[PDB]
Design a protein around this ligand. Structure first.
Ligand SMILES: [Ca+2]
Lengths: 548, 48
């Protein structure tokens, strides 16, 4: 079987329009993957300890210590938008559809190849690559999800984003329990705080091996591996955004006085004393019915502490925020809303002809207004009594704990039974698509890394590796790691991701926002005279929708 | 008052009281523990 192909390369995106404005979107993607043999054939238990950085008072946030198990296997991950759609497809989806559903997924490996490097050490010296028609590529598909879930998108180590550029997988490794203590401090702080790595707790040790828990497949050149189809069980994702905040819900006040001259500087007027109006309020001790005072059904969005690090058994970590963008973009407070920032390079969006190790990056700012503008907040004594007196107001300007740079908004939290929020929006092309759910008794209401969370089981991970190619002399009783013939593999990967979407219709007299090419961005969607490419990020929920 | 809201049974030496069977409707309880904190979720950083 050494002389014939076992597959077809396919990277077409098909749109199947069904009855009732429902679209069937089939995303074919295939790639050439290159794989080298492991540096070592054993599992290593390694600890990282950058105490040199955190030993400097006021550097707590740069903590990198952890323990991980380094495995001799590689992970083939394709969970990122860029792997399946090009800017052309994204425009069609984002401008036309109103919601997206994740249906099924499947992959395949074919046309496997294993070559061997012959070191013609002489003259230059030279190298020679020869096919080893009996060598084997090892393939393991963790279908029961025994292994820990490690989504490569998190560290931008997913499959490349160009159908015509070869790619590679990432070495697989997972976390291993450890106990760590780090006490906070600042520049002034005297002495040394407490920076200790206690070790490992016995009741939390879990050493996993692929050999012991998954059936391994041996593929030779004439072999091919296919996965069945997997059907997702997730909630639909909306491609629309809400714009109403608590201030724009319900019946506005009737204006007894209207403008008589064109110009947005000629205002209308309610025309009724603020303390003589009618309506409902949740302030029992006053008669002022203001647009900031009148009652609204519940609350859109919430306030959370910002640049807050909490600590537990293995060190400090940032407190996540699930928020939109409340606040005119020019003003914002991306910390308060927790906008994500993405760093990546060459293989996932950064200009292909660039040089150097500095990544490319961007901070995604959503369209939905479910965020907060802290500087606008304030708290006041119940006696009310305006104008409020300095002693009856806490401003995002008054210091807390004596600190001049810390607010109350800084540790404030207004999440409660009246809180309404929206899920996270897709992020093309660097975003992760789906995510496994936490196996805790009570689950989160959403995840901040991906729009689709598998309610049942997610698709298990696919691990690949080059089987050992031994020489004439091998001795099992040898501390010093043995010898293998330098071997590497090249194989084609192919996958299919099917979504189901719904076409939108016009409902307002005015046009809506739409993605479009133009004089300015034009050259971000075409190659350079040298063949340099790049994939600029786009936004997914242009197009408003009512909230209430 | 128990007298006003429940039927009272009088048992003498030769008497006996039995309850029927009652079937609970609760979520299962796990006899396992999790050890991962926010710091041990996902793909660790590749060590060069
Ligand atoms: Ca907006």
């Amino acid at each position: 079987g050494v002389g014939i192909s076992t597959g077809t390369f396919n990277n077409q995106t098909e749109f199947k329009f069904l009855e009732n404005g429902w679209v069937y979107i089939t995303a074919n993607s295939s790639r050439l993957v290159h794989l080298n043999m492991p540096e070592s054939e054993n599992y290593r238990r390694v600890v990282v300890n950058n105490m040199d950085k955190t030993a400097v008072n006021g550097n707590m946030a740069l903590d990198d210590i952890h323990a991980e198990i380094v495995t001799p296997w590689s992970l083939v991950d394709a969970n990122a938008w860029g792997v399946w759609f090009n800017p052309g497809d994204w425009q069609l989806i984002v401008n036309t559809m109103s919601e997206l559903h994740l249906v099924s997924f499947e992959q395949e490996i074919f046309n496997v190849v294993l070559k061997t490097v012959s070191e013609s050490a002489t003259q230059p010296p030279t190298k020679v690559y020869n096919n080893d028609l009996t060598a084997s590529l090892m393939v393991a598909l963790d279908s029961n999800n025994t292994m820990p879930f490690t989504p490569a998108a998190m560290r931008s180590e997913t499959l490349g984003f160009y159908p015509w550029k070869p790619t590679i997988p990432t070495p697989w490794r997972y976390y291993f329990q450890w106990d760590r203590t780090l006490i906070p401090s600042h520049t002034g702080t005297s002495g040394t705080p407490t920076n200790i790595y206690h070790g490992t707790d016995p009741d939390d040790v879990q050493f996993y091996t692929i050999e012991n828990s998954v059936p391994v497949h041996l593929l030779r050149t004439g072999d091919e591996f296919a996965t069945g189809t997997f059907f997702f069980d997730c909630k639909p994702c909306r491609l629309t955004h809400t714009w109403q905040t608590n201030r724009a819900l319900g019946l506005p006040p009737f204006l007894n006085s209207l403008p008589q001259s064109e110009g947005d500087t000629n205002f209308g007027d309610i025309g009724v004393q603020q303390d003589k109006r009618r309506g409902v309020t949740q302030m029992g001790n006053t008669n002022y019915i203001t647009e900031a005072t009148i009652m609204r059904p519940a609350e859109v969005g919430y306030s959370a502490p910002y640049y807050s690090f909490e600590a537990s058994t293995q060190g400090p970590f940032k407190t996540p925020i699930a928020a939109g963008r409340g606040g005119a973009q020019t003003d914002e407070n991306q910390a308060a809303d927790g906008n994500p920032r993405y760093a990546f390079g060459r293989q996932h969006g950064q200009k292909t002809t660039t040089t150097g190790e500095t990544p490319e990056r961007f901070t995604y700012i959503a369209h939905q207004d479910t965020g907060r503008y802290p500087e606008g907040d304030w708290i006041q004594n119940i006696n009310f009594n305006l104008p409020v007196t300095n002693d009856n107001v806490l401003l995002p300007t008054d210091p807390i704990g004596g600190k001049t740079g810390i607010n109350y908004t800084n540790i404030f939290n207004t999440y409660g039974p009246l809180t309404a929020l929206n899920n996270v929006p897709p992020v093309y092309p660097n975003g992760q698509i789906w995510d496994k759910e936490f196996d805790t008794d009570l689950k989160p209401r959403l995840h901040v890394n991906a729009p689709f969370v598998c309610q049942n089981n997610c698709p298990g991970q696919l691990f690949v590796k080059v089987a050992p190619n031994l020489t004439n002399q091998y001795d099992p009783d040898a501390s010093a790691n043995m010898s293998r013939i330098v071997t590497y593999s090249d194989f084609w990967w192919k996958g299919k991701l099917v979504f189901k979407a719904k076409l939108r219709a016009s409902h307002t007299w005015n046009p809506i926002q739409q993605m479009s090419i133009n004089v300015d961005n034009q050259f971000n969607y075409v190659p350079s005279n040298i063949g340099g490419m790049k994939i600029v990020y786009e936004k997914s929920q242009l197009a408003p929708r009512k909230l209430y």
